[PDB]
Amino acid sequence: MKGIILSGGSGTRLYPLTKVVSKQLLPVYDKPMVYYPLSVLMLAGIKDILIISTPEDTPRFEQLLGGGSELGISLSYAVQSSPDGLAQAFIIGEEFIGDDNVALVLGDNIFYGHGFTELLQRAANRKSGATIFGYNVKDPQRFGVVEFDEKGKVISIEEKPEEPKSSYAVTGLYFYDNRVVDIAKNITPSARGELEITDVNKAYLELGELHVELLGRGFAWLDTGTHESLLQASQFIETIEKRQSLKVACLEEIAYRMGYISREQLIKLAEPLMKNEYGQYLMNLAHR
Numbered sequence: 001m002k003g004i005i006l007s008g009g010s011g012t013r014l015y016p017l018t019k020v021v022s023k024q025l026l027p028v029y030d031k032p033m034v035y036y037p038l039s040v041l042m043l044a045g046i047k048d049i050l051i052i053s054t055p056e057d058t059p060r061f062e063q064l065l066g067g068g069s070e071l072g073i074s075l076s077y078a079v080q081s082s083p084d085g086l087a088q089a090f091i092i093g094e095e096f097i098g099d100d101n102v103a104l105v106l107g108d109n110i111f112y113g114h115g116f117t118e119l120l121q122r123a124a125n126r127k128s129g130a131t132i133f134g135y136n137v138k139d140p141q142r143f144g145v146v147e148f149d150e151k152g153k154v155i156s157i158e159e160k161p162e163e164p165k166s167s168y169a170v171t172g173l174y175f176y177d178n179r180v181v182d183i184a185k186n187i188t189p190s191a192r193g194e195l196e197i198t199d200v201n202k203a204y205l206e207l208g209e210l211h212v213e214l215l216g217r218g219f220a221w222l223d224t225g226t227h228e229s230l231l232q233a234s235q236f237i238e239t240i241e242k243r244q245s246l247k248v249a250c251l252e253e254i255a256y257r258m259g260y261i262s263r264e265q266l267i268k269l270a271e272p273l274m275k276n277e278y279g280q281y282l283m284n285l286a287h288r
């Protein structure tokens with residue numbers, strides 16, 4: 001499986017925050033937003049990842065994450081010339097994806113909760129169909145929305161409905177088989193002139209292979225779209241971290257716990273950052 005992080009968009013709502021800094025490099029407590037969705041692809045066992053951003057911000061993610069091999073993964077970069085919607089990721093990434101299955105995660109999505117990584121791996125290792133993730137939210141009409149039935153099987157899937165048929169939001173994390181690129185090629189802009197992931201999910205629904213994993217109320221799903229939610233997501237992270245002295249979405253911890261790196265490689269990483277807390281945190285970990 002390959003991974004794609006959609007990490008672009010013009011950053012309107014966060015102005016002036018986003019005047020000279022890209023949205024997904026802004027802090028969520030103690031590390032760049034982008035670390036959060038990257039962590040998720042890593043835990044799913046995806047080792048080969050395309051990061052998409054704007055022409056002016058794409059180089060700045062590349063300056064931060066490099067080419068991935070310090071995390072013992074592989075990272076690549078592509079420019080989205082402008083934000084024509086999320087399905088466009090599969091067009092822009094057609095060539096990085098090629099022959100394989102692909103998972104898409106939104107660059108401004110924070111996921112967290114016990115057992116989450118078991119769910120991610122089932123999905124990441126499924127070799128056909130789509131997997132999407134649902135979550136009971138306050139104002140479901142703000143999001144894609146999935147209604148399902150009895151057995152947990154999907155009866156519909158609609159983008160931002162004036163009258164939502166369900167509380168379960170479709171979240172910014174998606175797993176697909178190889179058919180998705182030719183799917184995204186063959187549908188067209190909506191009323192807001194974007195290529196909609198909902199219509200990508202609608203297609204899989206017709207093929208009879210759209211799976212939902214529904215996330216219960218023990219998971220957290222936040223997105224970092226506004227000054228209010230950004231700060232909220234921030235408080236929520238530091239509360240988890242202050243308490244347990246474990247970090248959320250520390251990339252190097254995940255590379256190592258996941259096998260992508262060795263103790264000795266983790267130690268080479270810790271070593272130059274020993275002047276700061278994040279480095280001592282990595283070093284503590286190698287000591288076990």
Ligand SMILES: O=c1ccn([C@@H]2O[C@H](COP(=O)(O)OP(=O)(O)O[C@H]3O[C@H](CO)[C@@H](O)[C@H](O)[C@H]3O)[C@@H](O)[C@H]2O)c(=O)[nH]1
Binds near residue numbers: 080083159223
């Ligand atoms: O072409 C694009 C479009 C969006 N983005 C970014 O991707 C994120 C998603 O866009 P946004 O406008 O914030 O959300 P919506 O487009 O309204 O909704 C999408 O993302 C939601 C995630 O909350 C889902 O619930 C919806 O079903 C899905 O349509 C944002 O961070 C954008 O900056 C890009 O980088 N390029």
Ligand SMILES: Cc1cn([C@H]2C[C@H](O)[C@@H](CO)O2)c(=O)[nH]c1=O
Binds near residue numbers: 249250253
């Ligand atoms: C093991 C591990 C889990 N997680 C996250 C995934 C889940 O959302 C939550 C519980 O595993 O913690 C990390 O962020 N980093 C880690 O190193």
